[PDB]
Amino acid sequence: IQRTPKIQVYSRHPAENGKSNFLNCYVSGFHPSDIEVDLLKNGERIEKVEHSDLSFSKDWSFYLLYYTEFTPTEKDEYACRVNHVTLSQPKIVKWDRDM
């Protein structure tokens, strides 16, 4: 049975413009394990992005944490783009500092 990934985009530390931090994209609740995850800065794929090793939850679903070092600003826009077999097209979730 296939399960569609849940996606959360958020900072490691409370977001403060001009302060160094980490931008995270948490992809979870998916099955099977193959997935494509991109972090976007103003719609452009971020190059220096690290990720955790393939793991899973008590309900058997897989999870990965994708992360990048960044300094948030007022003008800069961040998002996470995910592709998986359960999705007809890639899913984009924007970084909302309030979520």
Q: List residues binding another protein (CB under 8 A).
A: 1, 3, 6, 8, 10, 12-14, 22, 24, 26, 28-29, 31-33, 53-56, 58, 60-61, 65, 67, 98-99
Closest contact distance (angstroms) between CB of 19 and another protein is 15
Cβ closer to another protein: 20 or 43? 20
18 vs 88: CA distance, rounded Å = 37
84 vs 86: CA distance, rounded Å = 5
Token pair in block for residue 45: 């794929």
CB-based burial label for 85 (10 Å; 0-12, 13-18, 19+) = exposed
Closest contact distance (angstroms) between CB of 65 and another protein is 6
Closest contact distance (angstroms) between CB of 73 and another protein is 21
Cβ closer to another protein: 33 or 76? 33
Tell me how long the chain is: 99
